[PDB]
Design a protein around this ligand. Structure first.
Ligand SMILES: [Mg+2]
Ligand SMILES: [Mg+2]
Ligand SMILES: [Mg+2]
Ligand SMILES: [Mg+2]
Ligand SMILES: [Mg+2]
Ligand SMILES: [Mg+2]
Ligand SMILES: [Mg+2]
Ligand SMILES: [Mg+2]
Ligand SMILES: [Mg+2]
Ligand SMILES: [Mg+2]
Ligand SMILES: [Mg+2]
Ligand SMILES: [Mg+2]
Ligand SMILES: [Mg+2]
Ligand SMILES: [Mg+2]
Ligand SMILES: [Mg+2]
Ligand SMILES: [Mg+2]
Ligand SMILES: [Mg+2]
Ligand SMILES: [Mg+2]
Ligand SMILES: [Mg+2]
Ligand SMILES: [Mg+2]
Ligand SMILES: [Mg+2]
Ligand SMILES: [Mg+2]
Ligand SMILES: [Mg+2]
Lengths: 168, 175, 159
RNA sequence: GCUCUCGCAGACCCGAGCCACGCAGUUUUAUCCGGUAAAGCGAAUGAUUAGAGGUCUUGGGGCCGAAACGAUCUCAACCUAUUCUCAAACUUUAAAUGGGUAAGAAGCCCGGCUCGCUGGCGUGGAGCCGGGCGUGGAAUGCGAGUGCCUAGUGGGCCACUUUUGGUAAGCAGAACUGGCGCUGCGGGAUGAACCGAACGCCGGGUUAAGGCGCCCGAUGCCGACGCUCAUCAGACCCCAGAAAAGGUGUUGGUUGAUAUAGACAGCAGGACGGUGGCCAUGGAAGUCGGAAUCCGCUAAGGAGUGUGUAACAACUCACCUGCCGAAUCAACUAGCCCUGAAAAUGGAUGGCGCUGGAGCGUCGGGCCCAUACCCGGCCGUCGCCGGCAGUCGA
RNA sequence: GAGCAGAAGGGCAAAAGCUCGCUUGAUCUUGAUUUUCAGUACGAAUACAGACCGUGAAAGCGGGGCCUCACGAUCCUUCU
RNA sequence: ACGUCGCUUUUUGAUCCUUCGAUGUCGGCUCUUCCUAUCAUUGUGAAGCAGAAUUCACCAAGCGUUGGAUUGUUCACCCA
RNA sequence: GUCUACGGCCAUACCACCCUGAACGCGCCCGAUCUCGUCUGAUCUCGGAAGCUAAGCAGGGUCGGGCCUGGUUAGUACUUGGAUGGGAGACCGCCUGGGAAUACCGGGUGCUGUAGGCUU
């Protein structure tokens, strides 16, 4: 048997709203930069981040994005945090001004640094403003239960791509 | 666990290698699940009960859908299961006729829900075997072991009741 | 309602462990406490003089004063919506050196030596700790042995 | 308000190992803390059941021993090894969740100087003065620090879970988080708190929770599989009514038993002898009872299953046999349905109604719409302590 | 499984219990700190420092009671 | 019997949610309606139902359920 | 290989019974003049050196008790967080993570610091 490497990158979408959230879940969601429903972000997966995802499991749907998902998220909904502002990535100069010192000078560099986690994932990812996805077209199964029991919360391994196709 | 149409998954897992036993045994299970995510979850559920394994202390080295070997051959399936009722736990043997093992297990889940109000989290499939007609025991299955089987379709119900919704002619049932 | 007694609720907190009563071992009196080191306030109950209050049992602080038999400890206490640093005099029977600071000092010394050695040897080495990464890709041999089939057992009423 | 931090950038255009003072209702990695849950009582402290084995005893005593209970039989206590059952104010062991601390430049490593403290000692400790080390020594996110003046409030209530008193309470009292109060909106017919989601004025798209016979937007799908008939059916969190116990209604399941050496059920024959067995008695004969429970002939028969007599008699069973020709019997179990199930104005799955479902359980595909999400317009607030004195057609 | 004055809990064995011997640290002072806490007071307590002492061969130990309770502002009075 | 499961709100408690810028607080009399957990009457089933009488149960609230002494009485008790 | 003096951890070191102990040592042992204490030279204090390893002590033993450490019990009990899960309730199942304790069955039975001896 060939056991593939455990995935190093996750895409996390907040699926529940902001009403009646316990303080620890609230803090972890703020640390994940998911302060709104249907906000998505990339998370570099390790022990520290996974144990944070377990806390907010009822509130998020997350998984392992593929190359097409990363491409479409960056290209259609990619915005940069430039001078504390949400600026659309309409020119490579916007990426090169902020992340050029890390070798990232184009959308291709950004996509590479996200898909392969690389050395400057923290900088590139925090440069990315959190994605503001739409409501899922076609609906959700049940947002109040886990994915493995017929719902939407928690870790769906590679079905997060099916979710992404409908959410953007 | 919810449903859909179930598929069979061969899931092989093991404990993580430790400086006590470098090569731990590999365990294989047949899991009937809507998708491989649910299949992995149910595999961990079962091996935690059987062995002293966990998702954190172990890894899944394989998870692949098992295609039916003879999806064009009618056969009889016997299913041994255990389920939680409202007042106890029982073992059941049930029999179904199908072309696919996963289809028969889906039949079993629908039937347990219909007759015993048992949900999929209560049901726990533990054996599925293709049995012979001479080895079948349930009369509902056994009545189809007839080489010259023959029956009409007596009372055909009109199903296009709204195409047309209004009409002069009253429908016919005998065909 | 509740009394304000200084030892209310310490029935097990200040009691001795099982079969660990009697004379206090003398290495506890032989430990050396300097200013600036980190100590955990245990609070053993064999010695009643210099005993810490129950809110400091299980808390860790920094030594700022040394006397003949006690030390002064700056230990954080949370009072409603503020944390404030109390100074408490505790006899040395009720404290011990915190090993987290020992481990950190060991790691700092290791890092400094490794950096000095690495500049001389030429190549670069990693000094920061990292969280447990995702597991690598590997192969699992079967060794010509088929994996054992596992089947859930039937229910039987034990007793 | 103030004190700072990151930058601000190129006339247009065009980045040119390393990345802000610091902070955190979060995790990780180390390191401590605890005595709850659980567990335990052949471990201590308390509580408690039953047998067993013992050699001593102010145990009763125990039969023929008064005499040396010649003897050694029984019941106690006691001891030993076990055994059943427990603890908010018990405990060896002992979680989960949790609390503290650390994860560097105020650090690390070199030399030196001061001391009235300490002192075998150039000792110890502390302080001070120079010097050198940047791979900035986990993850993630965020700009921080600090002062003055200060209103209102100081009746709270509710929900998940933990939890005390009480039979309980829409009762009284705590813990934790969220909410209502202060809050509209979609859904729950209706509703302070439930579920979804929080709100500037709009257009388009899409959802949540919930639904899609008609009221009433949406299943007018040739939706899938079963279950269920109610002469009080059932019909969706909170939630707005039910239990034990029953059913030869039906549906699944478990376990056992009989049967082509003839089951089961029916109709049809036999159902004896010792013996009216013994003791009870007014009479108890197989049948009010107390023990026994055997034997022979047999295909088989109880010294009797029930009715019956004052007692007999007379029927009947279990037991065998004939006919009949192939599967059958029993005990459980749990789904729906029924019984249990009685209140006062006439009335409530919201109503109409619904039974090849508009009911129940398991599932599919479509579809409906919130002030939520996405795109766009417009208003305002906040931020960039953003740009413009270059009106510099030269 | 005793005792340590008392309620209970903790603690304690050439102890903190018992018996002796010598004693008056149950004394004179300034501050800091802990507990309740508003980080106010009182009470109680801890660690020191300066005196003067007690005891012991000494190391030391002692400024009340093994620890957790045993108590009291302004004004007035009284004494030193 | 020992036990155990319910229902009711014609008892009495428990609570304090509404009402203290007031909902007129006992009983009787008068009058209407409703409930059934049926006393009688209609139709039935069971008996330790021979008949007569009585008892238990079912469908069932259509119709009826009275005159008085004592007492403010509701209750109670007696006469008929 | 051991012991003595002083110890650190404070039973893997304790307890019961049995066996062995060479050499130093440690003891038991001999005595009360002095020192010092007693009802008692028993203990304590002092002065010794005839005898002895009988005792302490050391080492070993025991299908030994205990203690220590594993397995099992057991992914059981319990438990963080979730659901418009089930059930009249009592309670129960599942998802997401963590995860015990007996009984029962194994292994072990002091490590060591400083100073000083003995052991061909
Ligand atoms: Mg909510
Ligand atoms: Mg659509
Ligand atoms: Mg919720
Ligand atoms: Mg004292
Ligand atoms: Mg407690
Ligand atoms: Mg308990
Ligand atoms: Mg006990
Ligand atoms: Mg309350
Ligand atoms: Mg108010
Ligand atoms: Mg508010
Ligand atoms: Mg609101
Ligand atoms: Mg509404
Ligand atoms: Mg309603
Ligand atoms: Mg709209
Ligand atoms: Mg509707
Ligand atoms: Mg319509
Ligand atoms: Mg009913
Ligand atoms: Mg002094
Ligand atoms: Mg009025
Ligand atoms: Mg009125
Ligand atoms: Mg009636
Ligand atoms: Mg042993
Ligand atoms: Mg669990």
């Amino acid at each position: 048997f060939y056991v593939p490497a455990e995935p190093k990158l996750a895409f996390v979408i907040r699926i529940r709203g902001i009403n009646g959230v316990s303080p620890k879940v609230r803090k972890v969601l703020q640390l994940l930069r998911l302060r709104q429903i249907f906000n998505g972000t990339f998370v570099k997966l390790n022990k520290a981040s996974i144990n944070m995802l377990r806390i907010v499991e009822p509130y998020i749907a997350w998984g392992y994005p593929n190359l097409k998902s990363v491409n479409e998220l960056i290209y259609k909904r990619g915005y940069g945090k430039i001078n504390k502002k949400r600026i659309a990535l309409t020119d490579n100069a916007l990426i090169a001004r902020s992340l050029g010192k890390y070798g990232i000078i184009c959308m291709e560099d950004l996509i590479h640094e996200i898909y392969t986690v690389g050395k400057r994932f923290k900088e590139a990812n925090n440069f990315l403003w959190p994605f503001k996805l739409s409501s899922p077209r076609g609906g959700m199964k049940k947002k109040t239960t886990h994915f493995v029991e017929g719902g939407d919360a928690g870790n769906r391994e590679d079905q997060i791509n099916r979710l992404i196709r409908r959410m953007n | 666990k919810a449903s859909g149409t179930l598929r069979e998954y061969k899931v092989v897992g093991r404990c993580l290698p430790t400086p006590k036993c470098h090569t731990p045994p590999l365990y294989r299970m047949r899991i009937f699940a809507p998708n491989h995510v649910v299949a992995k979850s149910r595999f961990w559920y079962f091996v935690s009960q059987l062995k002293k394994m966990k998702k954190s202390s172990g890894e899944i080295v394989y998870c692949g859908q098992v295609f039916e070997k003879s999806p064009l051959r009618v056969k009889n399936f016997g299913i041994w299961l255990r389920y939680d009722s409202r007042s106890g736990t029982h073992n059941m043997y049930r029999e179904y006729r199908d072309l696919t093992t996963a289809g028969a297990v889906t039949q079993c889940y629908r039937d347990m829900g219909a007759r015993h109000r048992a949900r999929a989290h209560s049901i726990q499939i533990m054996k599925v075997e293709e049995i012979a007609a001479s080895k079948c025991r349930r009369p509902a299955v056994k009545q189809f072991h007839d080489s010259k089987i023959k029956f009409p379709l007596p009372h055909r119900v009109l199903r296009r009741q709204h195409k047309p919704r209004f009409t002069t002619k009253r429908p016919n049932t005998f065909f | 309602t509740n009394t304000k007694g200084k030892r209310r609720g310490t029935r097990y907190m200040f009691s001795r462990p099982f079969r660990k009563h009697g004379v206090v071992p003398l290495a506890t009196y032989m430990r050396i406490y300097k200013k600036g080191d980190i100590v955990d306030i245990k609070g053993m109950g064999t010695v009643q003089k210099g005993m810490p209050h129950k809110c400091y049992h299980g808390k860790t602080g920094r030594v700022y004063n040394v006397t003949q038999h006690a030390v002064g400890i700056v230990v954080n206490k949370q009072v409603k919506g503020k944390i404030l640093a109390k100074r408490i005099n505790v006899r040395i029977e009720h404290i011990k050196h915190s090993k987290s600071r020992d481990s950190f000092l060991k790691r700092v010394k290791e890092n400094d030596q490794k950096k000095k050695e690495a500049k001389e040897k030429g190549t670069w080495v990693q000094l920061k700790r990292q969280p447990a990464p995702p597991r690598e890709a590997h192969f699992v041999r079967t060794n010509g042995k088929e994996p054992e089939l596992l089947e859930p057992i039937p229910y039987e009423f034990m007793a």
